[PDB]
Amino acid sequence: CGAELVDALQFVCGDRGFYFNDLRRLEMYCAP
Amino acid sequence: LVDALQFVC
Amino acid sequence: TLCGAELVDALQFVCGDRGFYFNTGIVDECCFRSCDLRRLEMYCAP
Amino acid sequence: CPKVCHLLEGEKTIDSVTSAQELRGCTVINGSLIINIRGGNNLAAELEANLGLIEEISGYLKIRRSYALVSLSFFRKLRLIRGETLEIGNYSFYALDNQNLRQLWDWSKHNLTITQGKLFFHYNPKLCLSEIHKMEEVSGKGRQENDIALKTNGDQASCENELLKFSYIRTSFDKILLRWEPYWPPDFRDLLGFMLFYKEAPYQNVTEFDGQDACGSNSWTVVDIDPPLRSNDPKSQNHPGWLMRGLKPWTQYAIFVKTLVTFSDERRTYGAKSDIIYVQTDATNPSVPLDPISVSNSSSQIILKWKPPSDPNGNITHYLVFWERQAEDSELFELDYCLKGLKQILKELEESSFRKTFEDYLHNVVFVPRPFEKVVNKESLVISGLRHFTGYRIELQACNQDRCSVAAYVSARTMPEAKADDIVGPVTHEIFENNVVHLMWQEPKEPNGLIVLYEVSYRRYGDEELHLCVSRKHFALERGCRLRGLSPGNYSVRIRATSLAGNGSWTEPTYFYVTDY
Amino acid sequence: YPGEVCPGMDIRNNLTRLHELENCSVIEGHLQILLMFKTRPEDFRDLSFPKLIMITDYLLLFRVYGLESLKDLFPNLTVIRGSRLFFNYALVIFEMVHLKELGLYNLMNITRGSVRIEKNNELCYLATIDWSRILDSVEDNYIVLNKDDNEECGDICPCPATVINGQFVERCWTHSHCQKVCPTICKSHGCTAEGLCCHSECLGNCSQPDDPTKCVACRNFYLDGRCVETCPPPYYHFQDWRCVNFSFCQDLHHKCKNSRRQGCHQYVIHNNKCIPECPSGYTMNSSNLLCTPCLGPCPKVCHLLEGEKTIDSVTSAQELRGCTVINGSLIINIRGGNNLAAELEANLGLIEEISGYLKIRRSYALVSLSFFRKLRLIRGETLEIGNYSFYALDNQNLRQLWDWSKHNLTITQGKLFFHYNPKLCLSEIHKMEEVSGTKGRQERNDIALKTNGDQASCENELLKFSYIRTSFDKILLRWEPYWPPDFRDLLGFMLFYKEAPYQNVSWTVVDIDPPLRSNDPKSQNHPGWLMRGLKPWTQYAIFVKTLVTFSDERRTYGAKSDIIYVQTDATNPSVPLDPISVSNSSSQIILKWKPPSDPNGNITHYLVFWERQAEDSELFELDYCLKGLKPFEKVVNKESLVISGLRHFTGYRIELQACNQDTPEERCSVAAYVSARTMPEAKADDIVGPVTHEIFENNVVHLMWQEPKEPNGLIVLYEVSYRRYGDEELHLCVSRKHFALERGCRLRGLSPGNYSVRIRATSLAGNGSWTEPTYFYVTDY
């Protein structure tokens, strides 16, 4: 959570784990 | 059931 | 077929810059059952 | 297992788990059944555990006022009802007021035949019409007159639904990513959200209602998901989904998604559910090996036993073991032991309906028209090639792919050989004129661990026997042992060796004389 | 009000039409500003209407792009009267895309209606508004789906803070303006800048205090720059806010009478009012335009177009105000749970007949149909599909239809329909059947016998508990036998019990079989029940309830009993909690505990005992010079005790009890024992006097010193220190056994010369004082 959120977003977001400028809540939260 | 029998009686 | 914010968005798209008319309703015609662009135009001002 | 067990009067009511206990083991019931389960905990599981083995029933079956029942699956083995007694109107199967019955029997697989009596389902507010129609299919035209109040059976239930298809399934050792195609009712505002259910299911015999009670004890895990951000065309919108977390590796899971909508009299819609999908998480590192035990069946062979990690995280194969030597930590080659001293949902539905109502009203108003070993499938291993007394260390470690576990340690030491301590030959001695006698004995080159001292014993002719300690340092320094100040007379001397493990054999007696002055 | 009165406006598309409000000071109607899509903030930046102070009906904003706040559009808006509402709302802010804060920093009163601010995705400064100082009924508001509910609105408040729902937070409209709170004395009529109350006839802001001609918004009625509670005789009330002369009302009537192109009202005079129509029972005159009583019955018939009207809000109800006969059909379809019973009574109270049918569908909030205060006859000239004149499809909270004891309602034609009414008891429906005169025909869907009233207690008869018996863990109950008119209809009783810490009460349902039948009812056996596992001296709430078959032929309703509070019998309490004792002094100790975890009744007192304990026997026999060896009291209402008059450094034992009763056969808890040692005293172990010595010829010196009379527990050993003249110092340990054996200490092998010796004592607590120096000599050989 909050950093394991980062790990999970590395999982989910595929190969584009860019960060900080639910499933989908992280989806338009990570994609370049 | 000793108290139960007391209640019965 | 057109309900909620979609209804007003479609109305703005169709009327464009003609505006909306000034003076059973629209949702019984375009949300409760389907409506064509023929009906959607009547709500735009001349 | 009783097969012809009877009941008093041919009828019996069941209220709690205690009443149903009378039929435990009775494969065939020679008496009519009435079920009246209303409350409790783990009622479905208990009820199955007590009556699940029933196969045939003599008499007629009734279900009344069964608030607590959600499925009739606890008649797991029920196959036949003869229906001799029937009912008023000659009925065999009978159900009323089951305010929570949902399933009846899982009719995709289960089979049930009744010889006498028709079917009777009324006032079941949550029983879909598919289940009763399936009842009619295989209940046997020749027996039913249908006697179904089509307005009362499942009037609160969704009789017709669509099927959500998953469009993207991706797995980790502990989490699962699910995406499914979007479903939009004709009025998209009716979709309140999605409901996702999941449970660990090592077997594919999982239904939607197994192990469920009206009071609770649900076997599934409930997750609520908000509806997607609706956008024009599939080119712009994204599939709704969820990120399962907190799972266990190498574990099969049963998942299915259900759609939550607001009931409306106009434009009636019910939603969709997804078929049960079985997804297995990936395999990870296999915990840690359990309980190593070591004993040696020979001075050079040691036998090790252990146990597979409690959490295998995958079928376990290719066990890995190392051995290493553990020499003495010094301080023993210098110790002199001869010295002294040393040794409510309705509110939500209403409130959504209120938002929709105000929006519709506003729209209507405004818009106007115009070394190592590899162990395989054994929990034991015997080692070899170790010294007679040297201790060794073994770290065994469980593995999975050839991805393997952490580690585990265990120590051992082999039993010695007394021959390694034994001395050979007599004591070679020299005699000097100053009453000094020097004694030699064979040094064990390879003792059991280490020789700590030598026991030298000599006795004068006709007198007692004296003893002396010769440490390893003393043996290295004096090169043997010199007896000084001995009384005049004849002596016989024997020498024994002492090691870490024990003692060797005594040397042969040696005779010497001490001069008298 | 220094400005013109405008007749209420709709403004769409272009902002050019916004200029018709330029001179306006009161809007006599609604103000709608909506559907401006091409607008930008550069257009609204220089647009202001400071002269508007009052809106009579309501204000609606809907999709006006490019508007960021209203703090410039309506700087001085004060009162929204709310005579006519927009779906029971007097201020609607809906889907304003670019709005940031409201900014109506002069708004003081919304006299009627609620507020709805919804779907404003960039709107903040909402939680910083105390709506209780504007609307009297804030429970009917609807402020959702905004930026406040999504992210963390940055409400940087600039402003008397206020407490709402137990939270103290600041109040502000914008970042530069905040709410104008007024003293509680200045209630509902505003206050000056400095807090002085205004006149009771003024509303909102005012110029000078206590002045009837120096306020902006004017309570009650306004006339010639003054507020009047009632208009003077020459004038008549108009639009519930202003007084107009006869010329005004007559001119309005004449203007309306010349044409009917769109539709207006033939404004008419009544008892000091200028109303649109003559009320029921009156007819219009010819010349002076005054309502006069009729020569006979004059109902106010309200003809509904389309043949039927759905009532879902206060606006729909207001459309029927004053009508006595409805020439159509009414559907009551109120959603949202807002409890509009008051407005429904106000507007639909005078309805007397309904020509068609009456239908109540999905009325979640509705409690009872009593708001039809004068509904006397549902004629049923137009029936709902299925030949129904009364219809009830889904009423979650309907618990009553009318008060049939003093209400009379007849139905000329049609049947009745009742379905899915969980809280509507069947007895009420059957009474409606009897009263309405439907007997003679039949209702095919009269009642869904199990979907009506199955969430409400429909029992009517009363039953009495025969007797009650109490015990420390068990309670026995018996009650009178209930007997329905048909014996076979009985299905037993249900008993409920729950913990009752209060007297104004989750329940555990207990099913009981029907009582045993007997040939003689006088010989019938009374049913009863017994209970187990009850906490002692604890109160619970009990009752019983029957169950009978809902045979429509007899429609028996069962019975119910009362609710009673019964307390269990007290028993022995548990052990006292945290028993500790600390010797606060050498002769004082303090005992502290807490009440037992299970009082098992009212705690009365505590029993405390203490006594002296002898010291260990091993202390009198072990050698320590070797290496490696060394009356009662009852406490009431207190959880601490102090005991004085003790001996220092003496082992003591303290016993503490907890008793829940004193007089009737004392009932105390288990025995708790604690042992402690008091603090010592320094002077206890001190030695007195010097050391007496003797000298022998063999260089042996005997030393004798006084043992302490009252040591701290016991003296264990002594330390002897001696030093030769000009030499170092030597120490020696003398045990108690050695001291008793040698009657002191003997030094042997001392070197010749002069010596000085001092001796110190050692006790169980510490070391005492040293002895006086003693000199002795050792002979030289």
Tab-separated table of N, CA, C and O in Angstrom, chain D residues 314-388:
chain	number	residue	atom	x	y	z
D	314	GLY	N	3.575	-25.088	-4.833
D	314	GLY	CA	3.873	-25.856	-6.023
D	314	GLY	C	4.316	-27.256	-5.670
D	314	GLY	O	4.935	-27.458	-4.623
D	315	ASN	N	3.989	-28.232	-6.511
D	315	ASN	CA	4.402	-29.599	-6.238
D	315	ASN	C	5.916	-29.654	-6.145
D	315	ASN	O	6.625	-29.166	-7.028
D	316	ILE	N	6.408	-30.247	-5.064
D	316	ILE	CA	7.792	-30.050	-4.658
D	316	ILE	C	8.654	-31.120	-5.302
D	316	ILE	O	8.375	-32.318	-5.183
D	317	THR	N	9.747	-30.693	-5.929
D	317	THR	CA	10.676	-31.640	-6.537
D	317	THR	C	12.096	-31.090	-6.498
D	317	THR	O	12.290	-29.894	-6.281
D	318	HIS	N	13.088	-31.952	-6.699
D	318	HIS	CA	14.489	-31.510	-6.730
D	318	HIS	C	14.975	-30.907	-5.417
D	318	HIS	O	15.343	-29.735	-5.369
D	319	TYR	N	14.991	-31.703	-4.356
D	319	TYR	CA	15.491	-31.236	-3.066
D	319	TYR	C	17.008	-31.107	-3.071
D	319	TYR	O	17.715	-32.034	-3.471
D	320	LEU	N	17.513	-30.018	-2.507
D	320	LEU	CA	18.935	-29.706	-2.549
D	320	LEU	C	19.545	-29.778	-1.156
D	320	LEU	O	18.993	-29.223	-0.200
D	321	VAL	N	20.685	-30.461	-1.039
D	321	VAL	CA	21.392	-30.593	0.231
D	321	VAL	C	22.883	-30.350	0.030
D	321	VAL	O	23.475	-30.799	-0.957
D	322	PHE	N	23.490	-29.625	0.972
D	322	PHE	CA	24.930	-29.404	1.038
D	322	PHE	C	25.479	-30.059	2.295
D	322	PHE	O	24.779	-30.150	3.307
D	323	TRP	N	26.736	-30.493	2.249
D	323	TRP	CA	27.448	-30.856	3.464
D	323	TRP	C	28.750	-30.079	3.556
D	323	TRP	O	29.402	-29.807	2.543
D	324	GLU	N	29.118	-29.732	4.783
D	324	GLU	CA	30.340	-29.007	5.074
D	324	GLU	C	30.947	-29.572	6.348
D	324	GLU	O	30.243	-30.122	7.198
D	325	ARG	N	32.262	-29.438	6.474
D	325	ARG	CA	32.963	-29.942	7.642
D	325	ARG	C	32.990	-28.877	8.729
D	325	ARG	O	33.029	-27.678	8.443
D	326	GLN	N	32.959	-29.326	9.981
D	326	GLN	CA	33.001	-28.438	11.140
D	326	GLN	C	34.088	-28.949	12.079
D	326	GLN	O	33.828	-29.803	12.933
D	327	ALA	N	35.302	-28.431	11.916
D	327	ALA	CA	36.405	-28.826	12.777
D	327	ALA	C	36.249	-28.206	14.162
D	327	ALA	O	35.495	-27.252	14.367
D	328	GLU	N	36.979	-28.769	15.121
D	328	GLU	CA	36.922	-28.274	16.489
D	328	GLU	C	37.416	-26.835	16.553
D	328	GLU	O	38.376	-26.458	15.875
D	329	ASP	N	36.753	-26.029	17.378
D	329	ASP	CA	37.086	-24.613	17.478
D	329	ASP	C	38.281	-24.393	18.396
D	329	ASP	O	38.216	-23.576	19.322
D	330	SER	N	39.377	-25.112	18.139
D	330	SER	CA	40.607	-25.001	18.914
D	330	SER	C	40.360	-25.197	20.406
D	330	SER	O	39.371	-25.823	20.801
D	331	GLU	N	41.267	-24.681	21.235
D	331	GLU	CA	41.205	-24.696	22.694
D	331	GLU	C	41.261	-26.104	23.277
D	331	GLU	O	41.178	-26.254	24.501
D	332	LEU	N	41.401	-27.140	22.451
D	332	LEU	CA	41.503	-28.511	22.934
D	332	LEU	C	42.888	-29.114	22.764
D	332	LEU	O	43.287	-29.945	23.582
D	333	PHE	N	43.627	-28.715	21.727
D	333	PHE	CA	44.991	-29.190	21.542
D	333	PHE	C	45.947	-28.646	22.593
D	333	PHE	O	47.049	-29.187	22.745
D	334	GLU	N	45.556	-27.598	23.321
D	334	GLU	CA	46.410	-26.980	24.323
D	334	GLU	C	45.962	-27.232	25.755
D	334	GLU	O	46.761	-27.030	26.675
D	335	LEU	N	44.718	-27.654	25.967
D	335	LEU	CA	44.231	-27.896	27.317
D	335	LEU	C	44.979	-29.059	27.959
D	335	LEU	O	45.186	-30.106	27.340
D	336	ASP	N	45.384	-28.866	29.211
D	336	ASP	CA	46.092	-29.880	29.990
D	336	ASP	C	45.152	-30.346	31.095
D	336	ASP	O	44.972	-29.657	32.105
D	337	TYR	N	44.551	-31.521	30.902
D	337	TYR	CA	43.595	-32.044	31.871
D	337	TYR	C	44.268	-32.626	33.106
D	337	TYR	O	43.594	-32.829	34.121
D	338	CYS	N	45.573	-32.901	33.044
D	338	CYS	CA	46.291	-33.353	34.230
D	338	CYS	C	46.375	-32.270	35.297
D	338	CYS	O	46.519	-32.593	36.481
D	339	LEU	N	46.290	-31.002	34.906
D	339	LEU	CA	46.293	-29.912	35.871
D	339	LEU	C	44.999	-29.909	36.678
D	339	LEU	O	43.955	-30.386	36.224
D	340	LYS	N	45.080	-29.367	37.890
D	340	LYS	CA	43.921	-29.320	38.770
D	340	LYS	C	42.848	-28.399	38.202
D	340	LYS	O	43.142	-27.326	37.670
D	341	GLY	N	41.593	-28.829	38.320
D	341	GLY	CA	40.472	-28.035	37.860
D	341	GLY	C	40.180	-28.114	36.380
D	341	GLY	O	39.321	-27.369	35.897
D	342	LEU	N	40.862	-28.988	35.643
D	342	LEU	CA	40.656	-29.131	34.209
D	342	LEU	C	40.364	-30.585	33.874
D	342	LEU	O	41.013	-31.495	34.398
D	343	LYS	N	39.387	-30.795	32.997
D	343	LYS	CA	39.011	-32.136	32.566
D	343	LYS	C	38.374	-32.105	31.180
D	343	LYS	O	37.908	-31.061	30.725
D	344	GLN	N	-28.625	0.362	4.510
D	344	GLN	CA	-29.540	-0.567	3.862
D	344	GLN	C	-29.458	-0.419	2.353
D	344	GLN	O	-29.320	0.690	1.843
D	345	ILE	N	-29.534	-1.541	1.636
D	345	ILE	CA	-29.425	-1.489	0.182
D	345	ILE	C	-30.645	-0.817	-0.435
D	345	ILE	O	-30.548	-0.197	-1.506
D	346	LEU	N	-31.805	-0.916	0.218
D	346	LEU	CA	-32.994	-0.233	-0.281
D	346	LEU	C	-32.793	1.274	-0.288
D	346	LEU	O	-33.268	1.966	-1.196
D	347	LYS	N	-32.093	1.801	0.717
D	347	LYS	CA	-31.792	3.227	0.733
D	347	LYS	C	-30.956	3.620	-0.476
D	347	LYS	O	-31.222	4.642	-1.118
D	348	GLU	N	-29.951	2.810	-0.815
D	348	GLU	CA	-29.115	3.118	-1.967
D	348	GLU	C	-29.926	3.073	-3.254
D	348	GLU	O	-29.800	3.959	-4.113
D	349	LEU	N	-30.770	2.051	-3.404
D	349	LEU	CA	-31.585	1.948	-4.607
D	349	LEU	C	-32.527	3.135	-4.740
D	349	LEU	O	-32.643	3.734	-5.818
D	350	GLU	N	-33.202	3.498	-3.649
D	350	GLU	CA	-34.099	4.644	-3.679
D	350	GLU	C	-33.356	5.910	-4.009
D	350	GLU	O	-33.879	6.792	-4.695
D	351	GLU	N	-32.154	6.042	-3.489
D	351	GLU	CA	-31.457	7.302	-3.628
D	351	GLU	C	-30.909	7.472	-5.045
D	351	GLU	O	-30.955	8.574	-5.615
D	352	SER	N	-30.486	6.367	-5.669
D	352	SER	CA	-30.184	6.385	-7.104
D	352	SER	C	-31.420	6.690	-7.951
D	352	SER	O	-31.344	7.453	-8.931
D	353	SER	N	-32.558	6.074	-7.620
D	353	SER	CA	-33.785	6.364	-8.355
D	353	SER	C	-34.163	7.831	-8.219
D	353	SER	O	-34.679	8.437	-9.162
D	354	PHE	N	-33.905	8.417	-7.055
D	354	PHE	CA	-34.173	9.836	-6.864
D	354	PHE	C	-33.301	10.695	-7.768
D	354	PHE	O	-33.783	11.681	-8.344
D	355	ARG	N	-32.011	10.362	-7.893
D	355	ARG	CA	-31.176	11.174	-8.775
D	355	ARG	C	-31.695	11.091	-10.203
D	355	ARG	O	-31.798	12.105	-10.913
D	356	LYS	N	-31.999	9.873	-10.652
D	356	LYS	CA	-32.503	9.703	-12.008
D	356	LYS	C	-33.793	10.483	-12.209
D	356	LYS	O	-33.995	11.105	-13.260
D	357	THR	N	-34.674	10.467	-11.210
D	357	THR	CA	-35.950	11.158	-11.327
D	357	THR	C	-35.754	12.656	-11.476
D	357	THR	O	-36.387	13.293	-12.326
D	358	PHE	N	-34.881	13.244	-10.660
D	358	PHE	CA	-34.672	14.680	-10.784
D	358	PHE	C	-34.048	15.036	-12.121
D	358	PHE	O	-34.413	16.049	-12.727
D	359	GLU	N	-33.093	14.236	-12.590
D	359	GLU	CA	-32.480	14.535	-13.880
D	359	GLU	C	-33.510	14.480	-15.003
D	359	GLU	O	-33.557	15.371	-15.861
D	360	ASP	N	-34.358	13.452	-15.000
D	360	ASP	CA	-35.387	13.339	-16.026
D	360	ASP	C	-36.374	14.493	-15.951
D	360	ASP	O	-36.797	15.020	-16.985
D	361	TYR	N	-36.755	14.899	-14.739
D	361	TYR	CA	-37.678	16.018	-14.590
D	361	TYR	C	-37.076	17.309	-15.124
D	361	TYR	O	-37.748	18.072	-15.827
D	362	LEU	N	-35.808	17.570	-14.802
D	362	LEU	CA	-35.152	18.767	-15.310
D	362	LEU	C	-35.109	18.761	-16.826
D	362	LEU	O	-35.417	19.771	-17.470
D	363	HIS	N	-34.740	17.624	-17.416
D	363	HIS	CA	-34.669	17.545	-18.870
D	363	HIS	C	-36.036	17.771	-19.498
D	363	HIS	O	-36.151	18.433	-20.533
D	364	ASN	N	-37.084	17.214	-18.897
D	364	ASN	CA	-38.422	17.401	-19.440
D	364	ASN	C	-38.847	18.857	-19.368
D	364	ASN	O	-39.486	19.373	-20.289
D	365	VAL	N	-38.519	19.533	-18.269
D	365	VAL	CA	-38.948	20.917	-18.108
D	365	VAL	C	-38.214	21.828	-19.084
D	365	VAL	O	-38.836	22.637	-19.778
D	366	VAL	N	-36.886	21.710	-19.161
D	366	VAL	CA	-36.114	22.737	-19.859
D	366	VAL	C	-36.263	22.623	-21.373
D	366	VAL	O	-36.341	23.636	-22.072
D	367	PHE	N	-36.301	21.407	-21.909
D	367	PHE	CA	-36.268	21.207	-23.353
D	367	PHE	C	-37.682	21.179	-23.911
D	367	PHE	O	-38.460	20.276	-23.593
D	368	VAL	N	-38.001	22.147	-24.763
D	368	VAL	CA	-39.350	22.351	-25.274
D	368	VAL	C	-39.314	22.188	-26.786
D	368	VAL	O	-38.442	22.764	-27.437
D	369	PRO	N	-40.224	21.427	-27.381
D	369	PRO	CA	-40.231	21.280	-28.835
D	369	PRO	C	-40.924	22.447	-29.523
D	369	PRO	O	-41.712	23.181	-28.927
D	370	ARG	N	-40.624	22.590	-30.809
D	370	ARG	CA	-41.234	23.624	-31.634
D	370	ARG	C	-42.657	23.251	-32.036
D	370	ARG	O	-43.514	24.117	-32.219
D	371	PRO	N	30.594	-30.310	-1.519
D	371	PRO	CA	29.855	-31.467	-2.027
D	371	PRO	C	28.364	-31.337	-1.772
D	371	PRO	O	27.962	-30.797	-0.742
D	372	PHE	N	27.552	-31.825	-2.705
D	372	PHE	CA	26.106	-31.733	-2.576
D	372	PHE	C	25.473	-32.950	-3.232
D	372	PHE	O	26.057	-33.575	-4.121
D	373	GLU	N	24.266	-33.283	-2.780
D	373	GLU	CA	23.481	-34.360	-3.365
D	373	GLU	C	22.147	-33.788	-3.814
D	373	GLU	O	21.690	-32.769	-3.292
D	374	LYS	N	21.530	-34.430	-4.797
D	374	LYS	CA	20.239	-33.981	-5.296
D	374	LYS	C	19.225	-35.063	-4.948
D	374	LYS	O	19.282	-36.177	-5.476
D	375	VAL	N	18.315	-34.736	-4.055
D	375	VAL	CA	17.295	-35.665	-3.591
D	375	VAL	C	16.066	-35.518	-4.466
D	375	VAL	O	15.624	-34.401	-4.757
D	376	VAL	N	15.513	-36.648	-4.891
D	376	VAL	CA	14.274	-36.689	-5.655
D	376	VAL	C	13.325	-37.661	-4.967
D	376	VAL	O	13.744	-38.743	-4.546
D	377	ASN	N	12.067	-37.237	-4.811
D	377	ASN	CA	10.951	-37.994	-4.215
D	377	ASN	C	11.370	-38.912	-3.067
D	377	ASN	O	10.922	-40.056	-2.987
D	378	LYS	N	12.220	-38.433	-2.161
D	378	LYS	CA	12.471	-39.112	-0.894
D	378	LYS	C	12.667	-38.073	0.194
D	378	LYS	O	13.215	-36.998	-0.061
D	379	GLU	N	12.225	-38.394	1.406
D	379	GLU	CA	12.414	-37.525	2.556
D	379	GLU	C	13.579	-37.963	3.431
D	379	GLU	O	13.695	-37.502	4.572
D	380	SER	N	14.437	-38.844	2.925
D	380	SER	CA	15.566	-39.343	3.688
D	380	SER	C	16.783	-39.407	2.781
D	380	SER	O	16.661	-39.492	1.557
D	381	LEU	N	17.963	-39.361	3.393
D	381	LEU	CA	19.198	-39.484	2.635
D	381	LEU	C	20.295	-39.911	3.594
D	381	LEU	O	20.407	-39.390	4.706
D	382	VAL	N	21.104	-40.866	3.148
D	382	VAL	CA	22.215	-41.401	3.924
D	382	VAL	C	23.508	-40.863	3.336
D	382	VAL	O	23.726	-40.951	2.122
D	383	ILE	N	24.369	-40.326	4.189
D	383	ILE	CA	25.605	-39.692	3.752
D	383	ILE	C	26.743	-40.682	3.937
D	383	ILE	O	26.586	-41.698	4.621
D	384	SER	N	27.885	-40.394	3.316
D	384	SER	CA	29.058	-41.241	3.474
D	384	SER	C	30.334	-40.440	3.265
D	384	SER	O	30.280	-39.251	2.943
D	385	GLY	N	31.482	-41.083	3.441
D	385	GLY	CA	32.751	-40.388	3.297
D	385	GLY	C	33.009	-39.345	4.362
D	385	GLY	O	33.486	-38.247	4.051
D	386	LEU	N	32.700	-39.661	5.615
D	386	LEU	CA	32.998	-38.787	6.738
D	386	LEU	C	34.038	-39.452	7.626
D	386	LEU	O	34.201	-40.676	7.609
D	387	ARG	N	34.746	-38.636	8.403
D	387	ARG	CA	35.763	-39.168	9.296
D	387	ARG	C	35.112	-39.946	10.441
D	387	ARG	O	33.900	-39.887	10.665
D	388	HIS	N	35.945	-40.692	11.171
D	388	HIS	CA	35.430	-41.591	12.199
D	388	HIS	C	34.771	-40.836	13.348
D	388	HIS	O	33.860	-41.367	13.992
